[PDB]
Structure 1
Amino acid sequence: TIENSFVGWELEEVLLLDMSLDDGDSKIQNQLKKLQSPIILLYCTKEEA
């Protein structure tokens, strides 16, 4: 949808966290350090949110 639109939509710093091993490390926090922009999208489940 972004490409076929005259409005200048742009995306950057696409993140992906691995909630599979559940090591408890700060890999989530370390990855999210390089973040900006006032709008952030989330897609998770209630229990894990």
Structure 2
Amino acid sequence: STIENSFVGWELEEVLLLDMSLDDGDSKIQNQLKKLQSPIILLYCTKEEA
């Protein structure tokens, strides 16, 4: 809402949903981790997930 509220030319690469309850969840996550090129990443997690 705020990023399009400011109508300057932003560039949102991707948004990620992480599933740590499944061991194969990390392997699934690796596919989009291959798409990690931005130098800045916004993190959302708890400490144990951190």
Give the TM-score category using the shorter length. Answer: 0.5 to 0.7
Structure 2 unaligned blocks of 5 or more: none
- Give unpaired runs (5+ residues) of structure 1: none
Query: Do the aligned partners of residues 6 and 48 (structure 1) sit closer, same or farther apart at CA in structure 2, a change above 3 Å counting?
Result: closer
| Two-structure CA RMSD over aligned residues (Å) | 2.2
Out of 14-23 and 39-48, give the one that drifted further. Answer: 14-23
Q: Greater helix percent: which structure? A: 2
Judged with a 3 Å threshold, the aligned counterparts in structure 2 of structure 1 residues 27 and 11 are, in CA distance, closer, same or farther, namely same
Q: Which has the higher contact order (CA 8 A, sep 6+)?
A: 1
C-alpha displacement at 1:45, in angstroms?
A: 0.8
CA drift at 1:28: 2.1
Compute the TM-score of the two structures, normalised by the length of structure 2. Answer: 0.63
TM-score (norm 1): 0.64
> Contact 1:13–1:35 at 8 Å: present in 2 too?
no
Count, aligned residues: 49
